[PDB]
Design an enzyme around this catalytic site. Structure first.
Site, PDB file in Angstrom:
ATOM      1  N   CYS A  67      37.010  35.467  38.560  1.00  0.00           N
ATOM      2  CA  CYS A  67      37.000  34.085  38.081  1.00  0.00           C
ATOM      3  C   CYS A  67      35.622  33.717  37.548  1.00  0.00           C
ATOM      4  O   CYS A  67      35.500  33.170  36.429  1.00  0.00           O
ATOM      5  CB  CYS A  67      37.454  33.170  39.217  1.00  0.00           C
TER       6      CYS A  67
ATOM      7  N   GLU B 216      45.466  31.654  26.125  1.00  0.00           N
ATOM      8  CA  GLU B 216      44.177  30.913  26.317  1.00  0.00           C
ATOM      9  C   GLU B 216      43.088  31.459  25.389  1.00  0.00           C
ATOM     10  O   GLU B 216      42.408  30.647  24.679  1.00  0.00           O
ATOM     11  CB  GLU B 216      43.761  30.954  27.774  1.00  0.00           C
TER      12      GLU B 216
HETATM   13  C1  LIG Z   1      40.984  35.801  32.035  1.00  0.00           C
HETATM   14  C2  LIG Z   1      41.384  35.190  33.359  1.00  0.00           C
HETATM   15  C3  LIG Z   1      41.417  33.835  33.538  1.00  0.00           C
HETATM   16  C4  LIG Z   1      41.775  33.250  34.760  1.00  0.00           C
HETATM   17  N1  LIG Z   1      41.780  31.882  34.827  1.00  0.00           N
HETATM   18  C5  LIG Z   1      42.078  31.322  35.985  1.00  0.00           C
HETATM   19  C6  LIG Z   1      42.058  29.917  36.114  1.00  0.00           C
HETATM   20  O1  LIG Z   1      41.715  29.153  35.184  1.00  0.00           O
HETATM   21  N2  LIG Z   1      42.331  29.393  37.349  1.00  0.00           N
HETATM   22  C7  LIG Z   1      42.639  30.180  38.433  1.00  0.00           C
HETATM   23  O2  LIG Z   1      42.853  29.622  39.528  1.00  0.00           O
HETATM   24  N3  LIG Z   1      42.685  31.530  38.314  1.00  0.00           N
HETATM   25  C8  LIG Z   1      42.415  32.083  37.167  1.00  0.00           C
HETATM   26  N4  LIG Z   1      42.420  33.459  37.066  1.00  0.00           N
HETATM   27  C9  LIG Z   1      42.734  34.225  38.309  1.00  0.00           C
HETATM   28  C10 LIG Z   1      41.529  34.393  39.169  1.00  0.00           C
HETATM   29  O3  LIG Z   1      40.438  34.984  38.428  1.00  0.00           O
HETATM   30  C11 LIG Z   1      41.867  35.344  40.323  1.00  0.00           C
HETATM   31  O4  LIG Z   1      43.081  34.859  40.948  1.00  0.00           O
HETATM   32  C12 LIG Z   1      40.760  35.490  41.351  1.00  0.00           C
HETATM   33  O5  LIG Z   1      39.534  35.949  40.765  1.00  0.00           O
HETATM   34  C13 LIG Z   1      41.162  36.511  42.381  1.00  0.00           C
HETATM   35  O6  LIG Z   1      40.116  36.566  43.355  1.00  0.00           O
HETATM   36  P1  LIG Z   1      40.165  37.851  44.339  1.00  0.00           P
HETATM   37  O7  LIG Z   1      39.145  37.552  45.384  1.00  0.00           O
HETATM   38  O8  LIG Z   1      41.519  38.340  44.705  1.00  0.00           O
HETATM   39  O9  LIG Z   1      39.537  39.008  43.432  1.00  0.00           O
HETATM   40  P2  LIG Z   1      38.385  39.172  42.335  1.00  0.00           P
HETATM   41  O10 LIG Z   1      37.818  37.825  42.005  1.00  0.00           O
HETATM   42  O11 LIG Z   1      38.944  40.056  41.242  1.00  0.00           O
HETATM   43  O12 LIG Z   1      37.237  39.918  43.112  1.00  0.00           O
HETATM   44  C14 LIG Z   1      37.390  41.281  43.558  1.00  0.00           C
HETATM   45  C15 LIG Z   1      36.014  41.919  43.532  1.00  0.00           C
HETATM   46  O13 LIG Z   1      35.996  43.160  44.301  1.00  0.00           O
HETATM   47  C16 LIG Z   1      35.378  44.151  43.513  1.00  0.00           C
HETATM   48  N5  LIG Z   1      35.846  45.432  43.975  1.00  0.00           N
HETATM   49  C17 LIG Z   1      36.985  46.109  43.600  1.00  0.00           C
HETATM   50  N6  LIG Z   1      37.148  47.238  44.266  1.00  0.00           N
HETATM   51  C18 LIG Z   1      36.030  47.313  45.099  1.00  0.00           C
HETATM   52  C19 LIG Z   1      35.577  48.276  46.026  1.00  0.00           C
HETATM   53  N7  LIG Z   1      36.230  49.399  46.317  1.00  0.00           N
HETATM   54  N8  LIG Z   1      34.414  48.039  46.669  1.00  0.00           N
HETATM   55  C20 LIG Z   1      33.767  46.896  46.422  1.00  0.00           C
HETATM   56  N9  LIG Z   1      34.078  45.932  45.563  1.00  0.00           N
HETATM   57  C21 LIG Z   1      35.221  46.215  44.912  1.00  0.00           C
HETATM   58  C22 LIG Z   1      35.761  43.785  42.078  1.00  0.00           C
HETATM   59  O14 LIG Z   1      35.021  44.485  41.099  1.00  0.00           O
HETATM   60  C23 LIG Z   1      35.502  42.271  42.129  1.00  0.00           C
HETATM   61  O15 LIG Z   1      34.133  41.938  41.951  1.00  0.00           O
HETATM   62  C24 LIG Z   1      42.059  34.083  35.865  1.00  0.00           C
HETATM   63  C25 LIG Z   1      41.991  35.479  35.678  1.00  0.00           C
HETATM   64  C26 LIG Z   1      41.617  36.024  34.472  1.00  0.00           C
HETATM   65  C27 LIG Z   1      41.513  37.510  34.298  1.00  0.00           C
END
Ligand SMILES: Cc1cc2nc3c(=O)[nH]c(=O)nc-3n(C[C@H](O)[C@H](O)[C@H](O)COP(=O)(O)OP(=O)(O)OC[C@H]3O[C@@H](n4cnc5c(N)ncnc54)[C@H](O)[C@@H]3O)c2cc1C
Ligand SMILES: Cc1cc2nc3c(=O)[nH]c(=O)nc-3n(C[C@H](O)[C@H](O)[C@H](O)COP(=O)(O)OP(=O)(O)OC[C@H]3O[C@@H](n4cnc5c(N)ncnc54)[C@H](O)[C@@H]3O)c2cc1C
Ligand SMILES: COc1nc2ccccc2nc1CCC(=O)O
Ligand SMILES: COc1nc2ccccc2nc1CCC(=O)O
Ligand SMILES: [K+]
Ligand SMILES: [K+]
Lengths: 589, 589
Positions: free
Chosen positions: B149, B295
């Protein structure tokens, strides 16, 4: 209850059909009425839990308990055979048009409340007249049908606010990569006013078409209620006549006050004149501290104006004073000057308005501060925003027997009924009610349905949300923090709060820790949300949906269990955790 | 229930104090812990209806029923006398730091969910490590701490949307009286990207400071779970070591998919590359039809881009298809081209990106339509937006015993627990959950409180509101109309709807009857609102507050009894009356 309801419904309905959804005889009457272009209310007794009781009560009026039953102005007219008899004999038109009175409804005032009431009444076959007249301002300003909001209120104020917001959009656009030379960009007041007035003109026309299309009689005439059922009308030609009505709706609104100082009426203007002003106000003094005063000062400053607000005591009296302070602080930090604890004594004319080249005049304002210092400064325009008042003759109202309060507003029951039982008041003249357009419209439409369609729903005036469209907007629903503490005690109040920063403000280099929101909660009632307050962009969009949750009895836990939408300003309401009692700062990283 | 709760709470808490608010011995322990800088959870038994039962259960662990009682990692440590004994003997530091494991919590992934979980856990004295590593994209793009995000998702997409909205603000400003020569105004992509990346940089830094200030260990390392309590870490230097943790939170998110066609990986880009792209994309093809695809296409077109979207079947699969059609129609009418029922076959390179003068290359895209016609057109940039997928090794997960579904997502209980009982998954890798930042944050913070502070509250994943930040925004909460009809039958569904026109659009000469909203209701459940849908400006601000009312079980009558805020777009929700079953047009004057 059922008997009382039915008697009132039958007495007041212009044309009403008691029916059941599955009743072919009912359909035949519906088809005849629709063919004859006869509008009416319909009550489907099989969609009401007490429908069977209603059927039995109907025999007290008609001597039958079957459907369909048709009534006109309190008289049973017939079952299906009788209605088809009138139709086949060309008698039905004369029957549905027979009355002691010219109109089922006369609405005095064609504004937010009166147009809402009149259009809605006409749908149920109430023969309706709407009277509207705009007494000119002291400089001669007048406008068309639609009332304060349409012509000199919500509509033009929010459009001029939008022109002001677009100033900040031009500044922000450079930070977001747009290449524009702001040193060569200026605003043209008269081009903006022409735009705003073309939109208002489309509404004036729209309302006249809407009344024509609902078979409402529109009279551009001053109405005076001279007895319970008789309205004297005076046309533009000063010709006087009398029309009669069954129900009367007073919907005459208010007009701006002037202070009783020399020069105020002759040289000042009000919000009535500002929204069509043919010249740019230029260097402006706003006298007053209402939402109108601050809204007007705010957009004039964002359009490049040199603006001062002269404040007698506090800002936004009756609103949450923490929020009012933050609203005013934002304004003072963004180009609005405040002459605090100051009152005017006299306005002197230095130059007359140029009515040929559309430039302002020039005025000397003399006043004084509470510290004894004199105020003496020149302004091109002086705007009074010191309150609004109703315009009803106190003497004539007493003669007909309509009770007014000491402020000249109409004293009503919770169903808008005056002390004269066929006469109702809605909108800004209804004593004690929030003075808002959507309040007047809901009051007018709900009253029309009770009078003419047997509805029971009352208007709920509790927890009505508002927004102040200052440069940084302020939205609220429910109690101020001070009013919650006065009602329940400090020990039973918890306040959750946070600063926040719109994402839009980051790249634009606007302020941290200026936008602010809080929930005022009652500890002993499951942390019930008593008041919601937000200072930030799009504050009316933010606030509106929460007004539904507050109407339903939302608690803090209801807010916390809901997931935010990201990225928004409103989502901050779903993650508040800092209490005022904790003393922890509401600032955020 | 009380016994099961207490056993789980005592087993999992790092440092926890059972207390009562009025208990001077409890205060003395609180003062010692605060002096020694020992963070802990506190449960005040006199603020719990079953507190007296909890006191009695505590004797199963401590042999006493008095407060205070302090526990460390599942072991009773003492009453007030014992804790002060450890303090006075300089033993207390060693006791509160004694563990079988390096960390109470290891979070694998430093994104929306993992940073939320880690910061919240640390508050209760859980010794926490957050691992984050960003595997480079195929062209070598990488970024800092904070996840999808912050770096390549919600934050930069909404900032680039704002730059696009400011295009329309420049157009609108002329109608509202601003004097600007739009023929001389252009956008600079790289100036906007520098702004956006400076804000992202402030968040990357902010998160590192926030972890330091909560005594969380931040490792810029790839983590691999090799047994229930052991994480292998690989640092930037390819140095491998092992750390151990009590609880593990998998929060590793997803990355963009590529289609398996020649040239896609070598010559295309994804949303991972777009938000820091050093050159303007220029003439762009977006392959895909997700909210990301639309978007991205949308803002690039509003920044002066020549943009085409290549759509295999439908737009926004899984969203309300009436609303998706309106979203796409607005885009097509405002400068976005659509190649409908079309798929790509190959990308060929015509020019290499200019990495010295920051200009795009040139690509030939070959594809085909369902009608058999060939697609063959040159673009400067090709963006794939064809889905995202988790990155967990299916083999290693099976070896530790963490169950994945056929999509590679983690199969969890309603408390985020995996099939390995000390291991939890949150955010986008949690199978079946809405893939949203505020979902991941609420899931992470609520889980941390259950693990380390004896909380019971679960995350509610039902009726999570969303907004699509297309050029005309689309906000929704609850069911699509089609999904409501599939679940309850067409006879039990009523849909209220209206077009509307923002006041802002009047003077700006924008469209009538394009913004649109509807409520999907259940007739047999008091007209319960099952789904709310709005296409219009500021749709996330509009929608958010209604999400609280829907969580509470709002009905149509709840909407109708609430008074609008005027003038707003959101107020239209309070006056809907046209049903789809009536066949009456939703257009407005
Ligand atoms: C283009 C786009 C626009 C979006 N817009 C919106 C929006 O407007 N509003 C909204 O609510 N959501 C939005 N989303 C969704 C939102 O980004 C995600 O739901 C959110 O980031 C998920 O958070 P998370 O903690 O699951 O994972 P992430 O934020 O993906 O974080 C996971 C992290 O772990 C790291 N990682 C992976 N494997 C490992 C490993 N083995 N060891 C260590 N680190 C590792 C990754 O590289 C990353 O830094 C959007 C997504 C995208 C792609
Ligand atoms: C500057 C300003 C800004 C405002 N902004 C907002 C806002 O943003 N949102 C909001 O909700 N509210 C706002 N308001 C309040 C809103 O305008 C009023 O609450 C609303 O107009 C009241 O409607 P009403 O029907 O009571 O009366 P009005 O709209 O005042 O209509 C009464 C009409 O009756 C006419 N009339 C008077 N006497 C007679 C007579 N004897 N015969 C015939 N006709 C007569 C009047 O001239 C007028 O046309 C604003 C008000 C002002 C002044
Ligand atoms: C409601 O109007 C006022 N009420 C007051 C009550 C008590 C004391 C002063 C008051 N002043 C005003 C109106 C002008 C002002 O805000 O000073
Ligand atoms: C969820 O992804 C899809 N599911 C489908 C189900 C049934 C039929 C087709 C489907 N297509 C896609 C993804 C690409 C597309 O939208 O065409
Ligand atoms: K929440
Ligand atoms: K309403």
């Amino acid at each position: 209850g059922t008997s009382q309801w039915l008697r009132k419904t039958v007495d007041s309905a212009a044309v009403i059909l008691f029916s059941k959804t599955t009743c072919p005889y009912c359909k035949k009457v519906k088809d005849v009425l629709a063919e004859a272009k006869i509008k009416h209310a319909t009550i489907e007794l099989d969609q009401l839990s007490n429908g069977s009781a209603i059927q039995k009560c109907l025999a007290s009026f008609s001597k039958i308990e079957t459907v369909p039953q048709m009534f006109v102005r309190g008289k049973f007219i017939g079952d299906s055979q009788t209605v088809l008899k009138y139709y086949s004999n060309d008698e039905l038109a004369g029957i549905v048009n027979e009355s002691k009175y010219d109109y089922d409804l006369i609405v005095i005032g064609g504004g937010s409340g009166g147009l809402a009431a009149g259009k809605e009444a006409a749908k149920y076959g109430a023969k309706t007249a709407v009277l509207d007249y705009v007494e000119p301002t002291p400089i001669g300003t007048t406008w068309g049908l639609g009332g304060t909001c349409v012509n000199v209120g919500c509509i033009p104020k929010k459009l001029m606010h939008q022109a002001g917001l677009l100033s900040h959009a031009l500044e922000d656009a450079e930070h977001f990569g747009w290449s524009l030379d702001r040193s060569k960009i200026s605003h043209n007041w008269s081009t903006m006013v022409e735009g705003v007035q073309s939109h208002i003109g489309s509404l004036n026309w729209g309302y006249k078409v809407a009344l024509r299309d609902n078979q409402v009689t529109y009279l551009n005439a001053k109405g005076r209620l001279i007895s319970p059922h008789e309205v004297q009308i005076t046309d533009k030609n000063q010709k006087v006549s009398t029309i009669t009505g069954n129900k009367i709706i007073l919907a005459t609104g208010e007009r701006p006050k002037y202070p009783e100082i020399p020069g105020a009426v002759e040289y000042g203007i009000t919000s009535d004149d500002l929204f069509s002003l043919p010249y740019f106000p230029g260097k402006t003094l706003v006298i007053g501290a209402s939402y109108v005063a601050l809204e007007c000062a705010g957009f004039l400053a964002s359009l490049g104006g040199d603006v001062t607000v002269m404040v007698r005591s506090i800002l936004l009296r009756g609103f949450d004073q923490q929020m009012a302070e933050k609203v005013g602080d934002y304004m003072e930090n963004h180009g609005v000057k405040f002459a605090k604890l100051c009152v005017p004594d006299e306005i002197k004319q230095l130059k007359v308005v140029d009515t040929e080249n559309n430039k302002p005049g020039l005025l000397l304002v003399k006043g004084h501060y509470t510290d004894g210092k004199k105020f003496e400064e020149e302004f091109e325009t002086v705007i009074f925003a010191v309150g609004r008042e109703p315009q009803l003759s106190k003497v004539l109202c007493e003669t007909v027997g309509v009770k007014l309060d000491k402020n000249g507003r109409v004293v009503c029951t919770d169903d808008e009924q005056t002390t004269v039982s066929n006469v109702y008041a809605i909108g800004d003249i209804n004593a004690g009610k929030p003075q808002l357009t959507p309040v007047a419209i809901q009051a007018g439409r709900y009253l029309a349905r009770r009078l003419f369609a047997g509805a029971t729903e009352l208007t709920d005036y509790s927890n009505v949300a508002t927004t102040v469209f200052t440069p940084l907007e302020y939205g609220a629903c429910g109690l101020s923090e001070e009013d919650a503490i006065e009602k329940y005690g400090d020990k039973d109040i918890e306040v959750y709060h946070s600063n926040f920063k719109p994402l839009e403000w980051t790249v634009a280099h606007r302020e941290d820790n200026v936008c602010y929101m809080k929930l005022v909660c009652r500890k002993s009632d499951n942390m019930r949300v008593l008041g919601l307050h937000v200072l930030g962009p799009n504050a009316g969009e933010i606030t509106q949906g929460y007004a539904v949750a507050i109407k339903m009895g939302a608690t803090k836990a209801d807010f916390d269990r809901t997931i935010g939408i990201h990225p928004t300003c409103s989502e901050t309401f779903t993650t508040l955790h800092v209490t005022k009692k904790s003393g922890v700062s509401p600032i955020v990283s």
